[PDB]
Amino acid sequence: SLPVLQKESVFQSGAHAYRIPALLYLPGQQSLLAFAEQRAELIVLRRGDYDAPTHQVQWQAQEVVAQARLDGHRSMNPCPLYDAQTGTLFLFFIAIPANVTRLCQVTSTDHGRTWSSPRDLTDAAIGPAYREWSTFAVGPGHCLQLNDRARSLVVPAYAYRKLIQRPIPSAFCFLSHDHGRTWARGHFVAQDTLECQVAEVETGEQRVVTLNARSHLRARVQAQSTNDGLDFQESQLVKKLVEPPPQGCQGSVISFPSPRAQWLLYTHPTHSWQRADLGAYLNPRPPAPEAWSEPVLLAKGSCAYSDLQSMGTGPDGSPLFGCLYEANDYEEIVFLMFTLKQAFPAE
Numbered sequence: 090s091l092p093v094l095q096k097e098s099v100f101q102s103g104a105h106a107y108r109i110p111a112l113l114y115l116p117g118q119q120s121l122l123a124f125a126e127q128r129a130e131l132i133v134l135r136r137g138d139y140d141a142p143t144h145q146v147q148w149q150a151q152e153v154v155a156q157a158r159l160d161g162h163r164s165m166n167p168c169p170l171y172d173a174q175t176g177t178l179f180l181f182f183i184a185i186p187a188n189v190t191r192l193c194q195v196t197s198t199d200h201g202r203t204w205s206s207p208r209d210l211t212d213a214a215i216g217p218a219y220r221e222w223s224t225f226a227v228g229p230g231h232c233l234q235l236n237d238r239a240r241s242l243v244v245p246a247y248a249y250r251k252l253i254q255r256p257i258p259s260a261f262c263f264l265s266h267d268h269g270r271t272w273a274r275g276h277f278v279a280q281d282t283l284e285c286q287v288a289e290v291e292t293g294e295q296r297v298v299t300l301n302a303r304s305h306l307r308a309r310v311q312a313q314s315t316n317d318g319l320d321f322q323e324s325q326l327v328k329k330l331v332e333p334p335p336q337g338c339q340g341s342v343i344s345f346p347s348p349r350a351q352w353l354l355y356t357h358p359t360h361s362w363q364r365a366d367l368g369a370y371l372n373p374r375p376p377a378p379e380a381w382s383e384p385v386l387l388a389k390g391s392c393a394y395s396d397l398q399s400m401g402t403g404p405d406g407s408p409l410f411g412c413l414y415e416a417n418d419y420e421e422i423v424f425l426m427f428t429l430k431q432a433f434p435a436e
């Protein structure tokens with residue numbers, strides 16, 4: 090694999106098993122919040138202080154987000170987000186005991202230390218369609234906050250829809266313009282799209298929300314939005330971003346300040362038929378589908394779900410990246426930290 094600043098497991102199978110990582114960077118505190126599902130199923134958390142001089146992040150003790158759950162329900166798919174205009178930390182998740190899935194959220198005003206009680210967002214965020222679905226989910230992974238005047242909150246999601254045939258999945262985004270006070274359900278993207286993530290890319294003059302989703306084909310599906318996620322113009326398959334047919338695998342995408350507005354970074358297993366070899370792909374001409382690069386190798390061996398966070402400027406001057414990913418046959422969640430220079434010397 091390529092050179093990295095740090096490589097350590099932060100969650101490890103033992104008394105419990107850990108899966109479905111989500112990473113969040115709190116810019117002003119130079120630190121990260123690493124969430125995971127603890128499988129009696131809850132969401133756990135780990136806070137890490139990043140120290141540049143020593144090129145390392147120090148992880149504190151694992152904690153349970155006691156408030157992120159409903160009585161008699163298991164919690165899944167932790168989707169974190171930090172509101173830069175309020176200083177409020179959001180943690181969206183799914184609670185499960187014919188649709189019976191619930192959308193929830195818990196907030197923290199002290200950087201994750203404590204959390205408000207949950208808020209069941211289901212009925213108002215979904216409406217009548219709720220009955221037309223089999224189930225649904227958000228993320229997993231970090232969410233997105235836009236540049237629009239209202240600094241809208243965009244939460245990536247997908248739903249299993251029912252038209253004889255099994256429910257077909259379609260990605261979409263939950264949108265809030267009042268800082269998570271109310272929520273609207275965005276429009277689906279091409280059918281058969283699942284777990285996805287969204288990144289904002291300011292190109293030309295207008296904002297462009299790019300969406301990268303898991304599919305049932307040998308390739309990834311990517312869609313674009315010019316209306317903050319309400320509608321996703323069109324979606325194209327991206328041959329350069331493989332999906333092992335077994336059923337595919339969740340992937341992560343983020344935007345970051347270009348070295349010369351922003352570029353995209355994407356992580357996902359690179360093996361054609363197996364969930365192995367975590368690779369990093371770079372898109373310097375976002376969101377062009379054909380601009381995606383060959384993958385650079387980050388981790389060898391079995392790798393599954395992952396989540397990326399832009400961490401500012403790295404020790405070498407280039408963009409810094411933190412990555413949380415499932416590994417060794419789901420025996421742990423590994424935290425990886427590296428720079429644009431370490432991953433793409435040529436760019």
Ligand SMILES: CC(=O)N[C@H]1[C@H](OCC(C)C)OC(C(=O)O)=C[C@@H]1O
Binds near residue numbers: 165336
């Ligand atoms: C909410 C939930 O059950 N998520 C599952 C996810 O469902 C994929 C379906 C929708 C095709 O599958 C996997 C997986 O290892 O591929 C682990 C997640 O925990």
